Design a protein around this ligand. Structure first.
Ligand SMILES: Nc1ncnc2c1ncn2[C@@H]1O[C@H](CSCC[C@H](N)C(=O)O)[C@@H](O)[C@H]1O
Ligand SMILES: NC[C@H](O)c1ccc(O)cc1
Length: 258
């Protein structure tokens, strides 16, 4: 909470969504891997509905590129005002917005529906109805009278939980807190850092709870999820850059037992 007060959105984006990690040309990169996971999951047609909430969006939109064409009402969220402002600069196409075109383009490449990236970015901007404050540590993450339609048909969260919890236990409770926003039989698409303990965002150094695949699986189960899919990406040497000590990245497709 206090450590995140020095969090620099532009530095975070630069560290993880600009070359080399942000160079989507090589199919073995972490970016193409994450977009592939999201695309294939939605391509199954099993994850559908009207509303969807993205937990701890930070200043990024890539995690919703394949999702947007499946839900008409999308809520983006984040603990920091600076992030929500950054998200606004892109949704409004204001000056200085981050350029996600490489991710939009590759998402279109992977979905293989012959869509142009401008049409995809346009659908996302159109379907994002609101960017709200959020605290996964509160039993009621989005407050009491939130504008977001609850319960959501689906949830998506990337690099949030493990990046905001001191240990596994806090991680477990955080998952429980956001799981309350999801309707029974709903879907959760969780992406996160494997065995990572810190990552930089400008002047801020954030602590991370190093989690493993089994620990992530057991936690989803303990929260009442049937794990539909759970994949791991080992961070290659070329993408280890000193902005963190991440070892891998996991993707989980879990359905709320209900
Ligand atoms: N208590 C809390 N509850 C929810 N989000 C929190 C939080 N404390 C910090 N955060 C936010 O969690 C984010 C982690 S960075 C993740 C950004 C994006 N989802 C991606 O895929 O890269 C930051 O934007 C930070 O402000
Ligand atoms: N906390 C996010 C974590 O540092 C991270 C984010 C994105 C990556 O590609 C790799 C690692």
């Amino acid at each position: 909470a206090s450590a995140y007060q020095r969090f620099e959105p532009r530095a975070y984006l630069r560290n993880n969504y600009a070359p080399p990690r942000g160079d989507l040309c090589n199919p073995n990169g972490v970016g193409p891997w994450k977009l592939r996971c999201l695309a294939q999951t939605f391509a199954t047609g099993e994850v559908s509905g009207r509303t969807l909430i993205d937990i701890g969006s930070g200043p990024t939109v890539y995690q919703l590129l394949s999702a947007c064409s499946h839900f008409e009402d999308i809520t983006m969220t984040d603990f920091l005002e600076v992030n929500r402002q950054e998200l606004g600069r892109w949704l409004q196409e204001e000056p200085g917005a981050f350029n996600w075109s490489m991710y939009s383009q590759h998402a279109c490449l992977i979905e293989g529906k012959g869509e142009c990236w401008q049409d995809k970015e346009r659908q996302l901007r159109a379907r994002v109805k609101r960017v709200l404050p959020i605290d996964v540590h509160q039993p009621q993450p989005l407050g009491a009278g939130s504008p977001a339609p609850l319960p959501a048909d689906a949830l998506v969260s990337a690099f949030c939980l493990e990046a905001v919890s001191p240990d596994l236990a806090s991680f477990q409770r955080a998952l429980d807190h956001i799981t309350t926003l999801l309707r029974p039989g709903g879907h959760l698409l969780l992406i996160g850092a494997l065995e990572e303990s810190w990552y930089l965002a400008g002047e801020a150094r954030l602590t991370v709870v190093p989690v493993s695949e089994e620990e992530v699986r057991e936690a989803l189960v303990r929260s009442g999820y049937k794990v539909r899919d759970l994949r791991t990406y080992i961070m290659p040497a070329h993408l280890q850059t000193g902005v963190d000590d991440v070892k891998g990245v996991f993707f989980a497709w879990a359905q709320k037992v209900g």
